[PDB]
Every structure is written in structure tokens, then in C-alpha cells.
Amino acid sequence: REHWATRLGLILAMAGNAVGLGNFLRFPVQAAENGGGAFMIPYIIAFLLVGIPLMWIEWAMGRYGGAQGHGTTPAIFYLLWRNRFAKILGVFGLWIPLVVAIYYVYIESWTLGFAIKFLVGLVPEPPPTDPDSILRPFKEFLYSYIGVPKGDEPILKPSLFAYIVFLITMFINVSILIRGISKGIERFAKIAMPTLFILAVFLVIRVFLLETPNGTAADGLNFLWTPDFEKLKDPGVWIAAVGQIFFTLSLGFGAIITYASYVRKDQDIVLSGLTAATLNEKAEVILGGSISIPAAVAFFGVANAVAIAKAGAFNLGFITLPAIFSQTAGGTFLGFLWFFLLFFAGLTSSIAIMQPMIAFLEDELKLSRKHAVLWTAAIVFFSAHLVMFLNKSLDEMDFWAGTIGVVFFGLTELIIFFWIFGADKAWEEINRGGIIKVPRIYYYVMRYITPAFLAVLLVVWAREYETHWTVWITRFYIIGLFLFLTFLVFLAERRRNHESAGT
Numbered sequence: 001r002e003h004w005a006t007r008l009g010l011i012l013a014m015a016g017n018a019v020g021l022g023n024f025l026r027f028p029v030q031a032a033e034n035g036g037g038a039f040m041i042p043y044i045i046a047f048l049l050v051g052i053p054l055m056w057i058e059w060a061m062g063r064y065g066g067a068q069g070h071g072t073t074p075a076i077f078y079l080l081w082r083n084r085f086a087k088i089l090g091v092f093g094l095w096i097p098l099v100v101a102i103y104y105v106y107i108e109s110w111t112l113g114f115a116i117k118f119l120v121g122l123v124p125e126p127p128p129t130d131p132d133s134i135l136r137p138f139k140e141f142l143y144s145y146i147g148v149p150k151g152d153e154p155i156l157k158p159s160l161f162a163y164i165v166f167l168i169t170m171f172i173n174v175s176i177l178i179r180g181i182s183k184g185i186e187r188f189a190k191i192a193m194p195t196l197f198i199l200a201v202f203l204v205i206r207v208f209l210l211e212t213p214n215g216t217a218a219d220g221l222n223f224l225w226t227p228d229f230e231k232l233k234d235p236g237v238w239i240a241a242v243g244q245i246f247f248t249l250s251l252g253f254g255a256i257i258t259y260a261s262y263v264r265k266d267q268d269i270v271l272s273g274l275t276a277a278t279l280n281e282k283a284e285v286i287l288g289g290s291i292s293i294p295a296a297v298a299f300f301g302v303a304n305a306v307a308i309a310k311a312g313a314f315n316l317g318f319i320t321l322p323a324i325f326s327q328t329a330g331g332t333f334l335g336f337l338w339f340f341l342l343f344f345a346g347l348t349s350s351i352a353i354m355q356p357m358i359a360f361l362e363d364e365l366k367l368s369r370k371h372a373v374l375w376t377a378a379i380v381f382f383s384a385h386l387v388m389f390l391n392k393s394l395d396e397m398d399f400w401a402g403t404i405g406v407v408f409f410g411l412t413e414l415i416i417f418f419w420i421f422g423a424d425k426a427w428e429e430i431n432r433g434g435i436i437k438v439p440r441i442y443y444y445v446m447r448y449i450t451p452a453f454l455a456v457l458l459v460v461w462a463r464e465y466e467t468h469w470t471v472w473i474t475r476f477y478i479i480g481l482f483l484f485l486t487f488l489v490f491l492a493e494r495r496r497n498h499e500s501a502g503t
């Protein structure tokens with residue numbers, strides 16, 4: 001079985017797994033929608049009581065499974081719990097990352113296309129003071145790129161360029177994945193991570209240089225880092241915070257587990273996991289939180305910035321920010337840097353969310369790396385057309401897989417690993433070979449606090465939380481996908497059998 005060549009490579013690979021579009025696109029919006037500072041407290045708490053422990057747990061399960069030649073949850077869950085229902089539940093470990101990849105890769109392709117067009121200077125030309133006269137051109141830019149519906153039909157009409165760019169994006173993901181773990185994901189990580197850091201820092205500085213009659217970036221920072229204790233009793237804020245934690249730390253996606261399955265049986269996972277998580281958090285609250293929000297607040301003020309954040313999920317990153325940059329000298333190239341950053345983050349995450357499927361095809365169905373990668377890319381590519389041509393399909397997929405699925409699957413994996421498999425055994429497995437030991441209290445946090453916290457979370461959210469019929473188009477399909485995957489697992493367990501009878 002493949003293994004991470006170096007420690008640094010491992011750390012940067014995991015960090016590249018976590019640090020993605022969620023840091024620079026999702027976080028700003030989530031924090032802005034929930035009152036900025038009022039969103040941080042729960043966030044921080046969610047990081048301590050959920051993020052860290054689940055990270056460690058997934059690292060542990062990953063390494064454990066990898067020691068026996070398994071990297072995906074269908075087999076790992078069965079190793080931890082000898083029950084068919086464990087395999088069935090394990091299917092989600094492939095389903096979630098697949099579905100998420102299906103749209104994630106597309107958004108990534110967006111970032112790539114924008115990078116290209118901004119580099120060549122093929123961008124909108126806003127009339128040199130009316131805010132709408134400046135934003136409108138960019139909004140039209142995006143809408144024309146992805147093909148936002150102009151009528152009543154829920155149909156998207158992506159430009160030829162966007163499609164070709166998606167093709168190329170897929171080709172790059174494949175070019176990285178086909179070289180494997182050490183020569184592919186690791187090697188690339190060692191470049192993309194530094195590059196990403198540099199770009200992010202530069203952008204942060206440039207943004208900090210912004211000042212208008214409406215305010216400065218410091219106002220944005222203040223908006224983001226000022227506590228509001230009157231929202232601590234609001235369930236919604238907590239739900240948002242935890243969701244953001246899950247998404248940003250790649251928890252419940254089966255990606256961390258698969259990546260960890262390539263860590264040598266003896267190699268530490270405590271300090272490594274903690275370091276990756278910490279890196280992601282620094283890239284999120286410090287870098288991702290000091291770009292979009294501070295700029296939007298500097299140019300429009302707090303209220304208007306919040307309004308923009310609530311507008312949508314892509315408004316701030318693909319429309320507002322580039323529009324703001326266009327008002328400065330070298331703003332186009334600045335936009336280029338922005339979208340390039342976004343592209344690298346995206347890529348480094350996407351490869352991570354396709355590696356699970358690849359690893360299932362390799363480990364369980366005994367496919368070669370080439371064939372596994374190619375078939376995975378085929379499934380993703382084909383499935384992506386639904387996201388490309390059906391309006392709000394992306395939203396549905398993101399809700400069922402990227403929101404519900406990750407939390408439910410987190411609770412599931414926690415229950416299987418720390419309850420069924422054994423709390424003491426799980427603790428032992430986690431701390432084994434650790435450069436540092438997990439604080440004693442975290443035993444009680446993992447066994448009692450985290451599971452109850454989640455459970456309560458899911459129950460409250462489901463109880464307190466009207467769509468277009470076309471949603472059923474997506475659901476259906478993804479459901480199918482699940483079934484598909486299930487069947488594969490079946491085939492797998494059959495092959496195993498036939499293999500056992502022959503040995």
C-alpha cells in the first residue's frame with residue numbers, strides 16, 4: 001500500500017484537504033450572515049468540542065483501516081463493527097464525497113475560468129460612482145458565465161468557455177490523482193500550499209490598504225471579532241457554526257479517513273492532525289476572514305456588507321470582490337490573484353474528495369490506479385452535467401450531502417468508533433505512536449459531550465427546519481448514486497468471498 005513519503009508532505013496534504021473554497025468563500029458568508037462576532041463564539045466552541053475530536057477520530061480510523069489494506073468506510077466500519085449494517089452505513093463514506101465532488105469541482109472550474117479571463121483582461125468595463133453601475137457588469141459576467149436562467153424555466157445555459165474550462169479542470173484533477181499519493185497529491189501539495197499561503201497574505205495586505213468614505217478594513221475586522229452574547233441562545237447560529245466547522249475541516253466526508261489510511265501504522269496522528277486542523281483554522285479566520293469581509297465593509301459599510309453576504313453564496317466572491325478590486329490600480333490582476341488562490345485551494349480539496357472513491361475502487365475492487373482514477377473522473381464528469389444544466393441542483397446536493405450527510409456521518413462514525421468498537425480501545429488506537437498525548441478530558445469529551453452535542457443539534461435542526469419540484473430530479477439521481485455504490489460494495493464482498501474460497 002502507498003504511504004506518505006515525508007511528514008511535511010503529509011501535513012501539507014491534509015492541510016490542502018481542509019484549506020479550500022470553504023475558507024475563502026463559505027466562511028465569510030456564514031460569519032457575515034450570523035452577526036460576525038456573534039458567530040465566532042459558537043464557532044470557536046464548535047472547534048473545541050467537535051472539530052478537533054472528530055479530526056483525531058477520523059485520523060485514527062483512517063490509519064487503523066489502512067493497516068489492514070482498507071481506506072474507505074464500507075470496510076473500516078465493518079472492521080470496527082462486524083455487522084452488515086456497518087457496511088451499509090459505510091456506503092455514505094463514498095456517497096458523500098462523490099456527491100460533494102460533483103459540484104465542488106464545477107465551482108473550482110469557475111474559479112479557474114475567472115482566473116484565465118482576468119489574466120487576459122477579458123473582464124467587464126464598469127463606467128468610471130453609482131454602486132449598481134459598477135456591480136451590474138460583474139453580476140452579468142458571472143450570470144453569463146454559468147448561464148443563470150433569464151426566464152421561468154429552471155435551466156442553466158453555461159457558456160462554451162465554462163464547459164471547456166470544466167473539462168480542463170477535470171483533466172488537472174486527473175493529472176494529479178493518476179500519479180498517486182506520494183508522487184501526486186503530496187508533491188503537488190508541497191507547492192500549492194506555499195503558493196496559496198503567499199497569495200492569501202498578499203491579498204490580505206492589499207485589502208488592509210483599502211479605505212473609502214464608507215469605512216476601512218479595520219471596521220470589517222472589528223465587525224468580525226466583536227462578541228455578541230445575546231445570540232448564544234439562538235439555535236440557528238450554533239447550527240451554522242457547527243456546519244461550517246464540519247465543512248471546513250473536511251469532517252464527515254470520508255476524505256480525512258482515506259488520506260489517513262496511507263499513514264504508516266506506527267506514525268503519529270495526534271500532533272499531525274492537530275497541526276493540519278490548526279493550519280486550516282488559521283487559513284480560515286485569519287486569511288479567509290480578512291479579505292472579503294474587510295473589503296466589502298470598507299467599500300459599502302457593515303449593513304450593506306451583511307446584505308451582500310445574505311444575497312447569495314457566490315455573490316461576495318465572484319461579483320462583489322472583483323468589482324471592488326476594479327476600482328483600484330492593477331485591480332484586474334488582483335482579481336486574477338484572487339481567483340488563482342481560489343483555484344489552488346479548490347483543487348487541493350477536490351483531489352482529496354475524489355481519492356475516497358479512487359481508494360475504494362483500488363482496495364475493494366482491485367482496480368489499477370489508472371482505471372480507478374479514470375472511472376471516478378468519468379462518474380464525476382457525467383454526474384456534473386446535472387449541476388451544470390439544472391438550476392439549484394447544486395444547492396440540493398450541497399444540502400443533502402455537504403450539510404446533513406456530513407453531520408449525520410460524523411455522529412455515526414463517532415458512535416461506531418467510541419461506543420460500539422470500545423471507548424478505551426478507541427482512545428488507545430488514537431494515542432498509539434503519538435508524539436503528544438490527547439488531553440485526558442478529551443476522552444470524556446469524545447465519549448459523552450460530542451455525541452450528545454451533535455444529536456441535540458441534528459434533532460433541533462430537523463424539528464425546526466417549500467421547494468420547487470425540480471429538486472426531486474436531483475434527489476432521485478443522488479439516491480440512485482447511493483444504490484449504485486451499495487451495489488459495488490455488494491460486488492466487493494462477493495469478490496472477497498470468491499477470493500477467500502480460492503485461498
Ligand SMILES: CCCCCCC[Se][C@@H]1O[C@H](CO)[C@@H](O)[C@H](O)[C@H]1O
Pocket residue numbers: 116117120122123124159161
Ligand atoms: C487565453 C484564452 C482566454 C480567452 C477566452 C475567452 C473565452 Se470567454 C468570452 O469572453 C467574453 C468577455 O467576457 C465574453 O463576453 C464572451 O461571451 C466569451 O465568449
Ligand SMILES: CCCCCCC[Se][C@@H]1O[C@H](CO)[C@@H](O)[C@H](O)[C@H]1O
Pocket residue numbers: 156157158385386387389390
Ligand atoms: C443533465 C442533462 C444535461 C444535458 C443537457 C445538454 C444540453 Se444540449 C445543448 O446545450 C446548450 C447549452 O445550454 C443548449 O443551450 C442547446 O440548446 C442544447 O442543444
Ligand SMILES: CCCCCCC[Se][C@@H]1O[C@H](CO)[C@@H](O)[C@H](O)[C@H]1O
Pocket residue numbers: 157158159160163382385
Ligand atoms: C450527458 C448529456 C449530454 C450533455 C452534452 C454535453 C453538454 Se452539450 C455542450 O455544452 C456547452 C456548454 O453549455 C454548449 O455551449 C455547447 O454548445 C454544447 O455542445
Ligand SMILES: CCCCCCC[Se][C@@H]1O[C@H](CO)[C@@H](O)[C@H](O)[C@H]1O
Pocket residue numbers: 116160161164165
Ligand atoms: C485555456 C482556456 C480555454 C479557452 C477556450 C476558448 C475557446 Se471558447 C470561444 O468562445 C467563443 C464564444 O462562443 C466562441 O465563439 C469561440 O469560437 C471559442 O473559441
Ligand SMILES: CCCCCCC[Se][C@@H]1O[C@H](CO)[C@@H](O)[C@H](O)[C@H]1O
Pocket residue numbers: 153155156386389390
Ligand atoms: C437536466 C436539465 C435539462 C435542461 C437542459 C435543456 C437543454 Se435546452 C432546452 O431544450 C428544450 C428542447 O429540448 C427547449 O424547448 C427548452 O426551451 C431549452 O431550455
Ligand SMILES: CCCCCCC[Se][C@@H]1O[C@H](CO)[C@@H](O)[C@H](O)[C@H]1O
Pocket residue numbers: 021022025026107312313394395398
Ligand atoms: C464554497 C463551497 C461551495 C458552497 C456552495 C454553497 C451551496 Se448553495 C448555498 O448553500 C447554503 C447552505 O449553507 C444555502 O442555505 C444557500 O441558500 C445556498 O445558496
Ligand SMILES: CCCCCCC[Se][C@@H]1O[C@H](CO)[C@@H](O)[C@H](O)[C@H]1O
Pocket residue numbers: 048049438439440441442445
Ligand atoms: C475543550 C478541551 C480543552 C483542551 C485543553 C487541554 C488542556 Se487540559 C491539561 O491537559 C494535561 C494532559 O491531560 C493535564 O495533565 C493538565 O492538568 C490539564 O491542564
Ligand SMILES: CC(C)C[C@H](N)C(=O)O
Pocket residue numbers: 017018019020021022023100247248249250253255349350352353
Ligand atoms: C468538502 C471539503 C473538501 C471542503 C474543504 N474542507 C473546504 O473547506 O473547502
Ligand SMILES: [Cl-]
Pocket residue numbers: 144145159161162
Ligand atoms: Cl464566458
Ligand code: NA
Pocket residue numbers: 018019020022023247248249250280284
Ligand atoms: Na477548510
Ligand code: NA
Pocket residue numbers: 015016017018019020021344345346347348349350
Ligand atoms: Na484545498
